Write an enzyme that holds these catalytic residues in place. Structure first.
Site, PDB file in Angstrom:
ATOM      1  N   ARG A  68      41.334  36.782  44.666  1.00 30.75           N
ATOM      2  CA  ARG A  68      41.339  36.271  43.100  1.00 30.75           C
ATOM      3  C   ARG A  68      42.449  36.774  42.251  1.00 30.75           C
ATOM      4  NH1 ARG A  68      34.949  36.915  44.359  1.00 30.75           N
ATOM      5  NH2 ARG A  68      34.308  35.107  43.145  1.00 30.75           N
TER       6      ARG A  68
HETATM    7  N1  ADP Z   1      41.657  24.719  40.095  1.00 30.46           N
HETATM    8  C1  ADP Z   1      41.716  25.632  41.047  1.00 30.46           C
HETATM    9  N2  ADP Z   1      42.959  25.660  42.121  1.00 30.46           N
HETATM   10  C2  ADP Z   1      42.670  26.759  42.908  1.00 30.46           C
HETATM   11  N3  ADP Z   1      41.966  27.434  43.378  1.00 30.46           N
HETATM   12  C3  ADP Z   1      40.721  27.417  42.553  1.00 30.46           C
HETATM   13  C4  ADP Z   1      40.645  26.608  41.369  1.00 30.46           C
HETATM   14  N4  ADP Z   1      39.379  26.913  40.678  1.00 30.46           N
HETATM   15  C5  ADP Z   1      39.023  27.926  41.360  1.00 30.46           C
HETATM   16  N5  ADP Z   1      39.649  28.181  42.525  1.00 30.46           N
HETATM   17  C6  ADP Z   1      39.570  29.591  43.457  1.00 30.46           C
HETATM   18  O1  ADP Z   1      38.249  29.819  42.949  1.00 30.46           O
HETATM   19  C7  ADP Z   1      38.076  31.318  43.449  1.00 30.46           C
HETATM   20  C8  ADP Z   1      36.648  31.846  42.963  1.00 30.46           C
HETATM   21  O2  ADP Z   1      37.062  32.474  41.608  1.00 30.46           O
HETATM   22  P1  ADP Z   1      36.070  32.511  40.211  1.00 30.46           P
HETATM   23  O3  ADP Z   1      36.235  31.321  39.501  1.00 30.46           O
HETATM   24  O4  ADP Z   1      36.339  33.613  39.469  1.00 30.46           O
HETATM   25  O5  ADP Z   1      34.888  32.425  41.156  1.00 30.46           O
HETATM   26  P2  ADP Z   1      33.163  33.116  40.117  1.00 30.46           P
HETATM   27  O6  ADP Z   1      33.150  31.788  39.594  1.00 30.46           O
HETATM   28  O7  ADP Z   1      32.268  33.469  40.830  1.00 30.46           O
HETATM   29  O8  ADP Z   1      33.901  34.155  39.382  1.00 30.46           O
HETATM   30  C9  ADP Z   1      39.290  31.839  42.980  1.00 30.46           C
HETATM   31  O9  ADP Z   1      39.648  33.168  43.438  1.00 30.46           O
HETATM   32  C10 ADP Z   1      40.212  30.553  42.860  1.00 30.46           C
HETATM   33  O10 ADP Z   1      41.245  30.803  44.011  1.00 30.46           O
END
Ligand code: ADP
Ligand code: ATP
Ligand code: ADP
Ligand code: MG
Ligand code: MG
Lengths: 353, 382, 52, 236, 52, 64
Positions: free
Chosen positions: B247
């Site tokens: 992340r």
């Molecule tokens: N548009 C995107 N492009 C690439 N990876 C993405 C994208 N959106 C989310 N991710 C991936 O989603 C993973 C989950 O992160 P996060 O959104 O913080 O989860 P949560 O919603 O539980 O906090 C991230 O580490 C990231 O790599």
């Protein structure tokens, strides 16, 4: 102000069809939302419901004049710090108000920190303004109630939840609404435990939102981001009388194709793809092309993938999906559609394989 | 029992923590101050990966801590004996609460370990801590809780089994220079402390959608998912891309690695849907031939022996070879020979560029040119 | 072109004698440096054992 | 000796990792035994579990100079009687110590009987010997624990199992290890409820096993003995 | 003779790749023997210094 | 409506009994193919847009 308040009277509410554009293909094709409405991002752990919220912040809350509020209920302090500095290092900080009750803190803080953000937003609403309110995980507001419930001497309910779950949730969700004097537009991240959408806590929330965007792990694990499930996302605003016949009809055709593709997966899995009718193979090909084209590169996800972000307008996405459905791109390969902006960038990427 | 530093005391993670492994240092980068779950089934190489992360910090000024909760006592003695074998033990604290010991000691073991890790954090140093099974801590807490008659919830875990891991892992942090000054009464100036965590979780039958694995996927800053199918097929470490993520992402890598790796993990998520769909036949046979050549020789490339760490220099030119298309000329069975030869070639001929990339992040168009001049002079003389 | 045939017959066999020379010279050198690495490793794992 | 005891302290454990040579080709090749390990035995019935047990009881007495203990935890009385006879007429009875708390007994008997056999094996260990301890069904030890837990009135845990499940298992499985003076190896018949390797009882036991030998009806139908299956048998 | 020269030339390269990999394999065998023997014999030094 | 709707129950009942063949529909015989393609049309007939209610005359006319 006291953080305990009554919700506005039914007489004061207001209703607003004014559509609000976000440069995200799937969200504003499948589940468009309006100024003053509620949006919820439903998803398990690690499927992208915070990245999506930061992109909505980028696309709305920098291009918007009024104030904005951010409540971090029971989430990582690392991300609160990253957000605080992303704001401050672009001078938009002085139009955003922050409240943090992050996951370090004992249950009382995570329990009451949502009402504080709501109180600030309600003050801005009553002044006559229009406000943005982003809540970073509203599921932690009820989990903090489940933790406390048994000690308060209350008998457990369905899956160990407090007996007052629906009332605890309603008495909050009811004061976050627009009214005749001013409007609150909101986005709420809603964690789904064990990926179980029928758990009581997600189940009782769907009724409180106007646009529900349901993210899923079985799509994110294909690398397709944003991992929105179009057969489960929905919006109140998706009417012919609100978005026009062509937008509505494109969205319904896309759902129809993807559903017909779901129905074929078991026979494809048992008997392989060659037993399909000669036109079901075409449905499968267009469904996979549509699944790819729903993907988009975000500006906040550059750190993860290098590739630069894209902004796609609504006029520019319904055109592309109408094209894919009508068959005028059947000659391109699937990969030509993965992680591009509008349809022209797919027609280009095909040249380069 | 303590409350972690607040939102204004943190700093963003910006420094890499090299494990030894091509797979994680390139797809799932870890940075000082990050928390990164290792999750998988049993007998998948979780402990292998964690103590190979410890052993590698032997020489980079990071203090390491290893907490064993509910493990077999003989296995713990074997781990300590291996840490001593490779000279790492002089740099580690080992906190142990074996499978025999009272549930309260297992319940409280990782907080006692974080209390020792935070000593280095608050003084402006760096530490690394490994919770050997945070599944067994959750089980011990469930026991302590059911013996006190508390109403259980999903899977019979208590209501606050999230808060248990939450208040623990939220202590792995990076703190800015002002927090170190204030805490240390001005003794230490201009240094930022940190504490990196690598909790280990165990899943039944590959279920990453259970109660506790998903509670912890929700607290950490990424996860490394080790899949038993890959592990049985000999692909080790069995990193399953497309379920594993970081992340913080590239921000925690060296510049060179950050450029070379790029989208490789989403590349393999693509590939692993596509190779399961195209189980029968293919199209653009030439195009998917040179795709599932490299989209498959990557997987053949990232496998690595145990107790053989390789520096960032060595991983970097390897990812260059793979990513720029030079491996389209090689059959799968040759890859391991290819790398075994290349890493000796560059220790003979281009000896100082390795020293130069080990110190710096080192990326320039000069470096890319010189790194093609490295390929060519070798590719023609295997 | 009788002697064009003679020319090619001379040339390609010359080239075989050359390529099948350098292939084996090169593999001999590979074997030399592999048995060098063998000592560089064996005598370095000894230090590990005595420190242990 | 008192049957309740602490596991060997960390500084008593043997500072080496040796193997136990059973003398059975399939076992020694495909699934070696660590000296002081735990071994699961997943065969069904009709395949000759008890003749394998007798073969080990014999070889560990003759080839090494150890003894053996057989703890029958909650299994049919008939099997125990005909096993006692199958041993007496193969002369191995002189080299094994037997303790029996079969299904007919009250829960308190079936719960502790595993510890009696264990504390006899610990006596043989203190004498410097290498011991071999057979538990005729560890699953019934778990179930006796669940019954007693329900009798005491404690709250039910994951699938109805006692809350103390992993501690009740670890306090047994942790007393049988190698030691600077001796070692106890163990061969434990295992039974998996509903054929579910995810159920909490199998899942808890498998955390402690080192090897795992699976007997097969098929390999016996071929007339090949022992009926160990080389592809499903495993050792770490 | 042009044709059979074409054939018998590539004959030599077919042979040469085999005789390259054979000597490489032997180099690796001698490597593993060197390593295993040096390890087995250094273990005696360890054990004797410790027992002393 | 009681007279006319009595044929729709049977149309859809035979359709539900034959629906399992829709995925192999190419191999079917033309006798049952007509029932299978009639059920689909009477199903597509019952679709209707929101807020657009039909008087009993319109429903009877269409079901006829
Ligand atoms: N548009 C995107 N492009 C690439 N990876 C993405 C994208 N959106 C989310 N991710 C991936 O989603 C993973 C989950 O992160 P996060 O959104 O913080 O989860 P949560 O919603 O539980 O906090 C991230 O580490 C990231 O790599
Ligand atoms: N990179 C690797 N290459 C080859 N073998 C490996 C590698 N990593 C681990 N192994 C092997 O996998 C086996 C099991 O690994 P390990 O014990 O670390 O898994 P684990 O998750 O700790 O198991 P448990 O969860 O039961 O402790 C070990 O015997 C080790 O030899
Ligand atoms: N090693 C062996 N040599 C010869 N026959 C064997 C052997 N193992 C098993 N058998 C045959 O299979 C039978 C297995 O019977 P038994 O040992 O009572 O198995 P179980 O107790 O599991 O029912 C033996 O009585 C014999 O007929
Ligand atoms: Mg989040
Ligand atoms: Mg382990």
């Amino acid at each position: 102000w006291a953080i305990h308040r009554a919700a506005p009277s039914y007489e004061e509410l207001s209703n607003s069809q004014e559509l609000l554009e976000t440069g995200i293909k799937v969200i504003d094709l499948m589940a468009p939302f309006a100024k003053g409405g509620k949006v919820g991002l439903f998803g398990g752990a690690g499927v992208g419901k915070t990245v999506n919220m930061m992109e909505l912040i980028r696309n709305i809350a920098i291009e918007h004049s009024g104030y904005s509020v951010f409540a971090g209920v029971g989430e990582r302090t690392r991300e609160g710090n990253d957000f605080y500095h992303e704001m401050t290092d672009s001078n938009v900080i002085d139009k955003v108000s922050l409240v943090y009750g992050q996951m370090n803190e004992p249950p009382g803080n995570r329990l009451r920190v949502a009402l504080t953000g709501l109180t600030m937003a309600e003050k801005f609403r009553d002044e006559g303004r229009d406000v943005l309110l982003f809540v970073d995980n509203i599921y932690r507001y009820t989990l903090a109630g489940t933790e406390v419930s048994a000690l308060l001497g209350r008998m457990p309910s369905a899956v160990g939840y407090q007996p007052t779950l629906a009332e605890e949730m309603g008495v909050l969700q009811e004061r976050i609404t627009s009214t005749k004097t001013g409007s609150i537009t909101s986005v709420q991240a809603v964690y789904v435990p064990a990926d179980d959408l029928t758990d009581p806590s997600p189940a009782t929330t769907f009724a409180h939102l106007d646009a529900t965007v349901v993210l899923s792990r079985q799509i994110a694990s294909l690398g397709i981001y944003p991992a929105v499930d179009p057969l489960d996302s929905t919006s109140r605003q998706l009417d012919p009388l609100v978005v026009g016949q062509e937008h509505y009809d494109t969205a319904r055709g896309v759902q129809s194709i993807l559903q017909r593709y779901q129905e074929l997966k078991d026979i494809i899995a048992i008997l392989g793809m060659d037993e399909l009718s000669e036109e079901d193979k075409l449905v499968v090909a267009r469904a996979r092309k549509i699944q790819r084209f729903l993907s988009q590169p975000f500006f906040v996800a550059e750190v993860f993938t290098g590739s630069p972000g894209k902004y796609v307008s609504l006029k520019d996405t319904i055109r592309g999906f109408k094209g894919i459905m009508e068959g005028e791109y059947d000659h391109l390969p699937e990969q030509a559609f993965y992680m591009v902006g509008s349809i022209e960038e797919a027609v280009e990427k095909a040249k380069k394989l | 029992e303590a409350i972690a530093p607040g939102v204004i005391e943190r700093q963003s993670v910006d420094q890499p923590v090299q494990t030894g492994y091509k797979a994680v240092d390139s797809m799932i980068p870890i940075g000082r101050g990050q928390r990164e779950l290792i999750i998988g089934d049993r007998q998948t190489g979780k402990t292998a990966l964690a103590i190979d992360a410890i052993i590698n910090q032997r020489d980079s000024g990071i203090k390491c801590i290893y907490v064993a909760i509910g493990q077999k006592a003989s296995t713990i003695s074997n781990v300590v004996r291996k840490l001593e074998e490779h000279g790492a033990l002089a740099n580690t604290i080992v906190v142990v609460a074996t499978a025999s010991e009272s549930a309260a000691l297992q319940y409280l073991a990782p907080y006692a370990g974080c209390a020792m890790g935070e000593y280095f954090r608050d003084r402006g140093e760096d530490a690394l801590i490994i919770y050997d099974d945070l599944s067994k801590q959750a089980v011990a807490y469930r026991q302590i809780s059911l013996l006190l008659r508390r109403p259980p919830g999903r899977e019979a875990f208590p209501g606050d089994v999230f808060y248990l891991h939450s208040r623990l892992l939220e202590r792995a942090a990076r703190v800015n220079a002002e927090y170190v000054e204030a805490f240390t009464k001005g003794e230490v100036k201009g240094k930022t402390g940190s504490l990196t965590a690598l909790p280990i979780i165990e899943t039944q039958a590959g279920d990453v959608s259970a109660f506790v694995p998903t509670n912890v996927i929700s607290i950490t800053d990424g996860q490394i998912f080790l899949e038993t199918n890959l592990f049985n097929a000999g692909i080790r470490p069995a990193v399953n891309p497309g379920i594993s993520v970081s992340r913080v992402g590239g921000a925690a890598q060296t510049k060179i690695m950050k450029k070379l790796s790029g989208g490789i993990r989403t590349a393999l998520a693509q590939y692993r849907e596509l190779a399961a769909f195209s189980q029968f036949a293919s199209d653009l046979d030439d195009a998917t031939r040179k795709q599932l050549d490299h989209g498959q020789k990557v997987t053949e490339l990232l496998k690595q022996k145990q107790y053989a760490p390789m520096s960032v220099a060595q991983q970097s030119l390897v990812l260059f070879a793979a990513e720029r298309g030079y491996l389209a000329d090689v059959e799968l069975s040759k890859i391991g020979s290819f790398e075994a030869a290349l890493l000796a070639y560059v220790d003979r001929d281009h000896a100082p560029l390795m020293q130069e990339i080990n110190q710096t992040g080192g990326y320039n168009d000069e470096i890319e040119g010189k790194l093609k001049g490295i390929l060519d002079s070798f590719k023609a003389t295997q | 072109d009788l002697d064009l045939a003679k020319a090619s017959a001379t040339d390609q066999l010359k080239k075989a004698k050359a390529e099948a020379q350098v292939i084996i010279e090169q593999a001999n050198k590979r074997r030399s440096q592999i048995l060098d690495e063998a000592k560089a490793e064996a005598e370095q794992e000894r230090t590990k054992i005595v420190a242990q």
